[PDB]
Amino acid sequence: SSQIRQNYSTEVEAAVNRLVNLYLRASYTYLSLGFYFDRDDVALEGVCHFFRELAEEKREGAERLLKMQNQRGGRALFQDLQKPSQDEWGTTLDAMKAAIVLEKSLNQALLDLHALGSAQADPHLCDFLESHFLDEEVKLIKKMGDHLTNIQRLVGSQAGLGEYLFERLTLK
Amino acid sequence: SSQIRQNYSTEVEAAVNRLVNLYLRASYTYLSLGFYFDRDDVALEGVCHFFRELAEEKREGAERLLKMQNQRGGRALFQDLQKPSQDEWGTTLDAMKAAIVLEKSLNQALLDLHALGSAQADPHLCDFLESHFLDEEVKLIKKMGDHLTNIQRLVGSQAGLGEYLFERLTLK
Amino acid sequence: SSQIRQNYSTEVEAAVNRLVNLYLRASYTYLSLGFYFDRDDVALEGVCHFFRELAEEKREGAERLLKMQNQRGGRALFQDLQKPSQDEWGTTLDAMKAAIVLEKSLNQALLDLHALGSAQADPHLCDFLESHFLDEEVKLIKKMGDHLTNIQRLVGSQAGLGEYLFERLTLK
Amino acid sequence: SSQIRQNYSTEVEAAVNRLVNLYLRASYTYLSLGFYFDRDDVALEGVCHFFRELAEEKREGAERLLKMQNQRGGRALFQDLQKPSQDEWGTTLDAMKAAIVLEKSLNQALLDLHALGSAQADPHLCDFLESHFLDEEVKLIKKMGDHLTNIQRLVGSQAGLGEYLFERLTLK
Ligand SMILES: [Cl-]
Ligand SMILES: [Cl-]
Ligand SMILES: [Cl-]
Ligand SMILES: [Cl-]
Ligand SMILES: [Cl-]
Ligand SMILES: [Cl-]
Ligand SMILES: [Cl-]
Ligand SMILES: [Cl-]
Ligand SMILES: [Cl-]
Ligand SMILES: [Cl-]
Ligand SMILES: [Cl-]
Ligand SMILES: [Cl-]
Ligand SMILES: [Pt+2]
Ligand SMILES: [Pt+2]
Ligand SMILES: [Pt+2]
Ligand SMILES: [Pt+2]
Ligand SMILES: [Pt+2]
Ligand SMILES: [Pt+2]
Ligand SMILES: [Pt+2]
Ligand SMILES: [Pt+2]
Ligand SMILES: [Pt+2]
Ligand SMILES: [Pt+2]
Ligand SMILES: [Pt+2]
Ligand SMILES: [Pt+2]
Ligand SMILES: [Pt+2]
Ligand SMILES: [Pt+2]
Ligand SMILES: [Pt+2]
Ligand SMILES: [Pt+2]
Ligand SMILES: [Pt+2]
Ligand SMILES: [Pt+2]
Ligand SMILES: [Pt+2]
Ligand SMILES: [Pt+2]
Numbered sequence: 039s040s041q042i043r044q045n046y047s048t049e050v051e052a053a054v055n056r057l058v059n060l061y062l063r064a065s066y067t068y069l070s071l072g073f074y075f076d077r078d079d080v081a082l083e084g085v086c087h088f089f090r091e092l093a094e095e096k097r098e099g100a101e102r103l104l105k106m107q108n109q110r111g112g113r114a115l116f117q118d119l120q121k122p123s124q125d126e127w128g129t130t131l132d133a134m135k136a137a138i139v140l141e142k143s144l145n146q147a148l149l150d151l152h153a154l155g156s157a158q159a160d161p162h163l164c165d166f167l168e169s170h171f172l173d174e175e176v177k178l179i180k181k182m183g184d185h186l187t188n189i190q191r192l193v194g195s196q197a198g199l200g201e202y203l204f205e206r207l208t209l210k
Numbered sequence: 211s212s213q214i215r216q217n218y219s220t221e222v223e224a225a226v227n228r229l230v231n232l233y234l235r236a237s238y239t240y241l242s243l244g245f246y247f248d249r250d251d252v253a254l255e256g257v258c259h260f261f262r263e264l265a266e267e268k269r270e271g272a273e274r275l276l277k278m279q280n281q282r283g284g285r286a287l288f289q290d291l292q293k294p295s296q297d298e299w300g301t302t303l304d305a306m307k308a309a310i311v312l313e314k315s316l317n318q319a320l321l322d323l324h325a326l327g328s329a330q331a332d333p334h335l336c337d338f339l340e341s342h343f344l345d346e347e348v349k350l351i352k353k354m355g356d357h358l359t360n361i362q363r364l365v366g367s368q369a370g371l372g373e374y375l376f377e378r379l380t381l382k
Numbered sequence: 383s384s385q386i387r388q389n390y391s392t393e394v395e396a397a398v399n400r401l402v403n404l405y406l407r408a409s410y411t412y413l414s415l416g417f418y419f420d421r422d423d424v425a426l427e428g429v430c431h432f433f434r435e436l437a438e439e440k441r442e443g444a445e446r447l448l449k450m451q452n453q454r455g456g457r458a459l460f461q462d463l464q465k466p467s468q469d470e471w472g473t474t475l476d477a478m479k480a481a482i483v484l485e486k487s488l489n490q491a492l493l494d495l496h497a498l499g500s501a502q503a504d505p506h507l508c509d510f511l512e513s514h515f516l517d518e519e520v521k522l523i524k525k526m527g528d529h530l531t532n533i534q535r536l537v538g539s540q541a542g543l544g545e546y547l548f549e550r551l552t553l554k
Numbered sequence: 555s556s557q558i559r560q561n562y563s564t565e566v567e568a569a570v571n572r573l574v575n576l577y578l579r580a581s582y583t584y585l586s587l588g589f590y591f592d593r594d595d596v597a598l599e600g601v602c603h604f605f606r607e608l609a610e611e612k613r614e615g616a617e618r619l620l621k622m623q624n625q626r627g628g629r630a631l632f633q634d635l636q637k638p639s640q641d642e643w644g645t646t647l648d649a650m651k652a653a654i655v656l657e658k659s660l661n662q663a664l665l666d667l668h669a670l671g672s673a674q675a676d677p678h679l680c681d682f683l684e685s686h687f688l689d690e691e692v693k694l695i696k697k698m699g700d701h702l703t704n705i706q707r708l709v710g711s712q713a714g715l716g717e718y719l720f721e722r723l724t725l726k
């Protein structure tokens with residue numbers, strides 16, 4: 039219906055709107071994660087900083103998707119944003135496990151959208167995702183995996199010590 | 211219950227959580243406003259820019275409230291974020307009228323929270339709002355009022371012309 | 383037949399030659415558009431400048447295709463270049479409508495070539511188009527759509543006024 | 555009685571003198587805390603530095619109150635300064651617990667003085683405290699709470715190790 043729209047299916051348009059919702063939900067989750075680690079009874083500033091930076095990145099990803107939706111002549115449609123899955127996030131290990139589950143869900147949504155684009159013979163969409171999302175997700179997931187491994191080696195028989203040291207010597 | 215909490219009522223803690231929700235909702239609204247004016251069939255870049263900057267400011271306000279909630283020993287609780295009130299925002303005049311209604315609602319929430327703080331004899335809260343929110347809101351509302359007046363004078367018998375000129379000569 | 387040629391079909395080679403012709407034709411069209419707006423009885427310097435810059439870009443696109451044809455071991459074959467579809471281009475609105483029709487035809491040719499490359503399992507070709515042509519076309523088409531919307535809002539009941547203002551305040 | 559005094563009650567004047575005494579007492583306490591951590595058999599330089607900086611800050615707060623007392627036309631009256639509550643301060647955990655108790659007592663005195671000012675309709679006093687004391691106290695108390703949480707997580711089954719690491723990696 040737009041004057042500019044060309045080779046942009048309704049199915050891809052809708053799936054992009056849904057992916058915007060998922061990225062904004064993920065940003066909201068990271069916001070909650072960050073402020074949890076800033077509580078005086080949690081107090082891990084490098085962990086807070088790690089998650090607040092991811093909140094920014096996910097919002098930015100949403101904004102990139104929205105810009106692309108308008109460049110293609112689709113129409114942004116916003117839905118309610120559900121609250122994060124928890125109010126309290128446990129230990130740094132617990133939080134990093136929730137983070138990697140969240141990133142793998144975003145990655146799967148990206149892969150699903152790429153498959154849809156491929157089925158709809160939409161190369162601009164496929165290039166867009168390849169260029170700005172797929173590698174960024176793989177790199178982040180790798181980094182979170184590396185963090186989980188280091189967190190876990192640090193538990194030992196002194197879990198508090200290990201949590202402090204990881205925050206001080208990796209994250210800060 | 212926190213080790214740090216002192217003179218911070220449950221009523222203020224809850225009202226701060228609700229105000230965070232209102233600011234994040236307002237940011238979401240501004241996000242939608244901005245991307246609407248970036249549509250190829252709307253195409254008012256200075257209007258898009260105006261609203262995207264307000265989306266940033268409202269998110270920042272939420273983050274300031276959350277930081278203060280943790281400094282006082284309260285506990286951030288996030289709720290679902292409702293979607294904006296419209297999907298399409300009309301003319302620049304329509305959008306600026308919706309914006310001033312939104313800002314007056316935030317201002318009222320701030321005034322209500324200040325009244326609660328006063329009733330609870332919570333001077334740190336009152337100072338916080340005075341210092342970082344109340345003047346910012348008055349200044350913004352004044353600016354939006356000035357814009358509405360200029361938009362309206364520009365309608366005349368050539369509404370398209372006036373909309374272009376306001377975007378070009380005030381907003382851009 | 384070249385010593386270097388590998389995985390480069392005859393069908394893709396021919397289609398690249400045809401796309402070079404289309405890009406050079408488009409450059410020629412933009413040349414004519416630009417010099418039309420430089421006529422003393424048309425006299426819209428920002429419109430002339432807009433189209434002369436597109437003439438350059440389209441020639442550059444042709445040259446990129448030719449460089450790629452030789453990198454793959456294909457052989458450039460040039461055909462006659464037909465003259466542009468008009469001698470006189472009307473108003474800025476008329477000209478911008480002809481421009482977006484032209485860009486959508488180039489975009490379709492790019493999409494058709496990408497589909498051919500996909501059918502011929504030629505990933506270097508697909509990457510080439512994705513990297514240097516497909517996004518450039520979407521961005522240009524979006525920009526032209528934005529311009530058409532602004533031009534149209536400016537017609538009103540004073541078409542000459544609107545044409546001057548768009549040239550002065552958007553294009554120049 | 556001063557030529558300048560206006561809207562400055564006797565009750566506020568006396569309460570300001572008492573608050574000067576409390577701030578100077580707090581500085582003295584921090585002096586003792588700092589020199590304790592500089593003992594050769596305690597030897598935690600980052601802890602010493604933390605407390606010596608607080609000794610400076612509390613003296614500065616006293617001096618600000620005295621300057622304000624003279625700006626309002628009140629009259630500074632000094633009393634004996636009692637010695638700190640302990641001669642030896644234990645572990646870093648013990649010392650940080652004593653510090654937060656001390657800061658909460660200063661904060662309460664500030665809140666009490668603000669309430670008195672409010673009852674006496676003395677807005678200059680209320681502004682003074684809001685501007686230079688109330689937020690500074692909340693921020694400090696938050697920081698001490700964060701430190702206590704980190705100190706406690708570090709005790710584990712190796713209290714000496716944890717005390718060294720906190721001094722090295724947070725305080726120094
Ligand atoms: Cl479709
Ligand atoms: Cl920070
Ligand atoms: Cl939910
Ligand atoms: Cl309460
Ligand atoms: Cl922009
Ligand atoms: Cl709703
Ligand atoms: Cl072949
Ligand atoms: Cl020129
Ligand atoms: Cl011809
Ligand atoms: Cl009096
Ligand atoms: Cl030193
Ligand atoms: Cl004593
Ligand atoms: Pt940070
Ligand atoms: Pt960082
Ligand atoms: Pt693909
Ligand atoms: Pt890109
Ligand atoms: Pt990117
Ligand atoms: Pt902008
Ligand atoms: Pt700006
Ligand atoms: Pt107040
Ligand atoms: Pt402040
Ligand atoms: Pt501020
Ligand atoms: Pt020029
Ligand atoms: Pt130029
Ligand atoms: Pt492809
Ligand atoms: Pt390239
Ligand atoms: Pt390129
Ligand atoms: Pt020092
Ligand atoms: Pt220092
Ligand atoms: Pt007050
Ligand atoms: Pt001051
Ligand atoms: Pt100050």
